[PDB]
Motif scaffolding. Structure first.
Motif, PDB file in Angstrom:
ATOM      1  N   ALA A  85      -1.256  -1.694   8.486  1.00  0.00           N
ATOM      2  CA  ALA A  85      -2.169  -0.951   7.624  1.00  0.00           C
ATOM      3  C   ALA A  85      -1.411  -0.071   6.645  1.00  0.00           C
ATOM      4  O   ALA A  85      -1.719  -0.068   5.447  1.00  0.00           O
ATOM      5  N   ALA A  86      -0.427   0.684   7.133  1.00  0.00           N
ATOM      6  CA  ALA A  86       0.535   1.285   6.222  1.00  0.00           C
ATOM      7  C   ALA A  86       1.203   0.220   5.370  1.00  0.00           C
ATOM      8  O   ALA A  86       1.042   0.217   4.147  1.00  0.00           O
ATOM      9  N   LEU A  87       1.934  -0.709   6.004  1.00  0.00           N
ATOM     10  CA  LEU A  87       2.651  -1.738   5.256  1.00  0.00           C
ATOM     11  C   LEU A  87       1.767  -2.415   4.228  1.00  0.00           C
ATOM     12  O   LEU A  87       2.246  -2.782   3.155  1.00  0.00           O
ATOM     13  N   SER A  88       0.485  -2.607   4.532  1.00  0.00           N
ATOM     14  CA  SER A  88      -0.438  -2.926   3.455  1.00  0.00           C
ATOM     15  C   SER A  88      -0.339  -1.886   2.351  1.00  0.00           C
ATOM     16  O   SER A  88       0.242  -2.148   1.295  1.00  0.00           O
ATOM     17  N   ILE A  89      -0.829  -0.675   2.615  1.00  0.00           N
ATOM     18  CA  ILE A  89      -0.831   0.399   1.625  1.00  0.00           C
ATOM     19  C   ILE A  89       0.581   0.739   1.164  1.00  0.00           C
ATOM     20  O   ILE A  89       0.826   0.887  -0.038  1.00  0.00           O
ATOM     21  N   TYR A  90       1.520   0.887   2.103  1.00  0.00           N
ATOM     22  CA  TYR A  90       2.925   1.066   1.738  1.00  0.00           C
ATOM     23  C   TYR A  90       3.369   0.042   0.703  1.00  0.00           C
ATOM     24  O   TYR A  90       4.008   0.392  -0.294  1.00  0.00           O
ATOM     25  N   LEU A  91       3.045  -1.231   0.926  1.00  0.00           N
ATOM     26  CA  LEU A  91       3.395  -2.258  -0.047  1.00  0.00           C
ATOM     27  C   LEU A  91       2.375  -2.305  -1.180  1.00  0.00           C
ATOM     28  O   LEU A  91       2.737  -2.517  -2.343  1.00  0.00           O
ATOM     29  N   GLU A  92       1.097  -2.089  -0.858  1.00  0.00           N
ATOM     30  CA  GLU A  92       0.052  -2.112  -1.878  1.00  0.00           C
ATOM     31  C   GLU A  92       0.254  -0.997  -2.899  1.00  0.00           C
ATOM     32  O   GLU A  92      -0.168  -1.121  -4.055  1.00  0.00           O
ATOM     33  N   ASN A  93       0.893   0.103  -2.492  1.00  0.00           N
ATOM     34  CA  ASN A  93       1.335   1.089  -3.472  1.00  0.00           C
ATOM     35  C   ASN A  93       2.431   0.506  -4.351  1.00  0.00           C
ATOM     36  O   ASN A  93       2.353   0.572  -5.584  1.00  0.00           O
ATOM     37  N   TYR A  94       3.448  -0.086  -3.724  1.00  0.00           N
ATOM     38  CA  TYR A  94       4.507  -0.756  -4.464  1.00  0.00           C
ATOM     39  C   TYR A  94       3.958  -1.915  -5.287  1.00  0.00           C
ATOM     40  O   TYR A  94       4.592  -2.335  -6.260  1.00  0.00           O
ATOM     41  N   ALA A  95       2.793  -2.444  -4.908  1.00  0.00           N
ATOM     42  CA  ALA A  95       2.117  -3.426  -5.747  1.00  0.00           C
ATOM     43  C   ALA A  95       1.793  -2.850  -7.114  1.00  0.00           C
ATOM     44  O   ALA A  95       2.409  -3.225  -8.118  1.00  0.00           O
ATOM     45  N   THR A  96       0.860  -1.892  -7.160  1.00  0.00           N
ATOM     46  CA  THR A  96       0.328  -1.414  -8.432  1.00  0.00           C
ATOM     47  C   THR A  96       1.436  -0.894  -9.339  1.00  0.00           C
ATOM     48  O   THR A  96       1.288  -0.868 -10.568  1.00  0.00           O
ATOM     49  N   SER A  97       2.571  -0.521  -8.753  1.00  0.00           N
ATOM     50  CA  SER A  97       3.650   0.065  -9.534  1.00  0.00           C
ATOM     51  C   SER A  97       4.432  -0.983 -10.317  1.00  0.00           C
ATOM     52  O   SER A  97       4.825  -0.727 -11.461  1.00  0.00           O
ATOM     53  N   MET A  98       4.664  -2.161  -9.732  1.00  0.00           N
ATOM     54  CA  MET A  98       5.602  -3.105 -10.331  1.00  0.00           C
ATOM     55  C   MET A  98       5.104  -3.623 -11.673  1.00  0.00           C
ATOM     56  O   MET A  98       5.845  -3.616 -12.664  1.00  0.00           O
ATOM     57  N   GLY A  99       3.868  -4.080 -11.728  1.00  0.00           N
ATOM     58  CA  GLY A  99       3.374  -4.583 -12.981  1.00  0.00           C
ATOM     59  C   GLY A  99       3.255  -6.096 -12.990  1.00  0.00           C
ATOM     60  O   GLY A  99       3.751  -6.817 -12.120  1.00  0.00           O
ATOM     61  N   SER A 100       2.562  -6.561 -14.017  1.00  0.00           N
ATOM     62  CA  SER A 100       2.357  -7.974 -14.331  1.00  0.00           C
ATOM     63  C   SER A 100       1.718  -8.698 -13.146  1.00  0.00           C
ATOM     64  O   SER A 100       0.879  -8.143 -12.431  1.00  0.00           O
ATOM     65  N   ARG A 101       2.126  -9.946 -12.926  1.00  0.00           N
ATOM     66  CA  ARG A 101       1.612 -10.714 -11.800  1.00  0.00           C
ATOM     67  C   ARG A 101       2.349 -10.358 -10.524  1.00  0.00           C
ATOM     68  O   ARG A 101       1.833 -10.553  -9.419  1.00  0.00           O
ATOM     69  N   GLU A 102       3.568  -9.849 -10.655  1.00  0.00           N
ATOM     70  CA  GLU A 102       4.297  -9.482  -9.457  1.00  0.00           C
ATOM     71  C   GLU A 102       3.725  -8.219  -8.839  1.00  0.00           C
ATOM     72  O   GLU A 102       3.845  -8.026  -7.627  1.00  0.00           O
ATOM     73  N   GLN A 103       3.087  -7.368  -9.643  1.00  0.00           N
ATOM     74  CA  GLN A 103       2.145  -6.404  -9.090  1.00  0.00           C
ATOM     75  C   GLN A 103       1.101  -7.103  -8.230  1.00  0.00           C
ATOM     76  O   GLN A 103       0.837  -6.690  -7.096  1.00  0.00           O
ATOM     77  N   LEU A 104       0.507  -8.180  -8.751  1.00  0.00           N
ATOM     78  CA  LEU A 104      -0.457  -8.945  -7.967  1.00  0.00           C
ATOM     79  C   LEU A 104       0.198  -9.618  -6.768  1.00  0.00           C
ATOM     80  O   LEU A 104      -0.415  -9.704  -5.698  1.00  0.00           O
ATOM     81  N   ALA A 105       1.431 -10.103  -6.927  1.00  0.00           N
ATOM     82  CA  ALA A 105       2.135 -10.745  -5.822  1.00  0.00           C
ATOM     83  C   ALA A 105       2.294  -9.795  -4.644  1.00  0.00           C
ATOM     84  O   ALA A 105       2.080 -10.174  -3.487  1.00  0.00           O
ATOM     85  N   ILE A 106       2.674  -8.551  -4.926  1.00  0.00           N
ATOM     86  CA  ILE A 106       2.914  -7.575  -3.872  1.00  0.00           C
ATOM     87  C   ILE A 106       1.613  -7.224  -3.161  1.00  0.00           C
ATOM     88  O   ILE A 106       1.586  -7.029  -1.939  1.00  0.00           O
ATOM     89  N   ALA A 107       0.513  -7.148  -3.913  1.00  0.00           N
ATOM     90  CA  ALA A 107      -0.772  -6.794  -3.323  1.00  0.00           C
ATOM     91  C   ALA A 107      -1.280  -7.894  -2.397  1.00  0.00           C
ATOM     92  O   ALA A 107      -1.833  -7.607  -1.330  1.00  0.00           O
ATOM     93  N   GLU A 108      -1.109  -9.160  -2.787  1.00  0.00           N
ATOM     94  CA  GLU A 108      -1.542 -10.250  -1.923  1.00  0.00           C
ATOM     95  C   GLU A 108      -0.640 -10.428  -0.717  1.00  0.00           C
ATOM     96  O   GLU A 108      -1.028 -11.114   0.237  1.00  0.00           O
ATOM     97  N   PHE A 109       0.562  -9.854  -0.743  1.00  0.00           N
ATOM     98  CA  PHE A 109       1.369  -9.832   0.468  1.00  0.00           C
ATOM     99  C   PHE A 109       0.941  -8.683   1.371  1.00  0.00           C
ATOM    100  O   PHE A 109       1.049  -8.776   2.598  1.00  0.00           O
ATOM    101  N   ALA A 110       0.433  -7.597   0.778  1.00  0.00           N
ATOM    102  CA  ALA A 110      -0.069  -6.473   1.563  1.00  0.00           C
ATOM    103  C   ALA A 110      -1.378  -6.826   2.255  1.00  0.00           C
ATOM    104  O   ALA A 110      -1.871  -6.069   3.102  1.00  0.00           O
ATOM    105  N   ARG A 111      -1.966  -7.967   1.893  1.00  0.00           N
ATOM    106  CA  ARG A 111      -3.188  -8.421   2.548  1.00  0.00           C
ATOM    107  C   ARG A 111      -2.886  -9.091   3.878  1.00  0.00           C
ATOM    108  O   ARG A 111      -3.387  -8.649   4.918  1.00  0.00           O
ATOM    109  N   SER A 112      -2.091 -10.163   3.859  1.00  0.00           N
ATOM    110  CA  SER A 112      -1.737 -10.904   5.061  1.00  0.00           C
ATOM    111  C   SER A 112      -1.242 -10.019   6.194  1.00  0.00           C
ATOM    112  O   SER A 112      -1.379 -10.401   7.359  1.00  0.00           O
ATOM    113  N   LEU A 113      -0.671  -8.859   5.882  1.00  0.00           N
ATOM    114  CA  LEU A 113      -0.208  -7.911   6.883  1.00  0.00           C
ATOM    115  C   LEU A 113      -1.308  -7.473   7.842  1.00  0.00           C
ATOM    116  O   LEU A 113      -1.008  -7.106   8.981  1.00  0.00           O
ATOM    117  N   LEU A 114      -2.572  -7.531   7.421  1.00  0.00           N
ATOM    118  CA  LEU A 114      -3.629  -6.859   8.163  1.00  0.00           C
ATOM    119  C   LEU A 114      -4.284  -7.750   9.210  1.00  0.00           C
ATOM    120  O   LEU A 114      -5.210  -7.298   9.894  1.00  0.00           O
TER     121      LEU A 114
END
Lengths: 73, 59
Positions: free
Chosen positions: B1-30
């Motif tokens: 749940a952290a690693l979701s948000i922990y990574l989902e925070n790092y998601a919105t920060s990166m940008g472009s589609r790799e922002q999206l890439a990080i967020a969809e990896f923060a999903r499978s964690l849950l």
């Protein structure tokens, strides 16, 4: 066949200009706010959720479609 | 749940589609806490979303 879409620009102008009149306060158009509106609310996809992250996040997903559509189409 | 948000925070920060890439990896964690809702018969979101409901910063 090109002539219809020509005038539809002028009255929308007239409207949206009178709309800049009808409301002097004017936000950025073209899906500007809806980008952050995701993050803005997706903050609470982080914060509150009981289930509410799907409830806030999908809506956060729902916000950006207006630029998302025109962008990706 | 952290690693979701922990990574989902790092998601919105990166940008472009790799922002999206990080967020969809923060999903499978849950799903790992959710397959706990399998055996313990818990409520996956009420499990996992409220897991994510727990933070000041992510940790």
């Amino acid at each position: 066949q090109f002539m219809e879409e020509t005038e539809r620009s002028l009255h929308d102008a007239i409207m949206i200009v009178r709309r800049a009149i009808k409301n002097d306060s004017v936000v950025a158009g073209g899906g500007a706010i809806e980008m952050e509106l995701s993050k803005y609310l997706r903050d609470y996809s982080r914060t509150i959720p009981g289930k509410q992250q799907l409830l806030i996040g999908a809506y956060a997903k729902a916000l950006e479609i207006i630029p998302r559509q025109l962008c990706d189409n | 749940a952290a690693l979701s948000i922990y990574l989902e925070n790092y998601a919105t920060s990166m940008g472009s589609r790799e922002q999206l890439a990080i967020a969809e990896f923060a999903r499978s964690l849950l799903v790992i806490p959710n397959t706990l809702a399998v055996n313990a018969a818990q409520d996956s979101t009420d499990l996992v979303a409220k897991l994510r409901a727990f933070h000041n910063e992510a940790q």
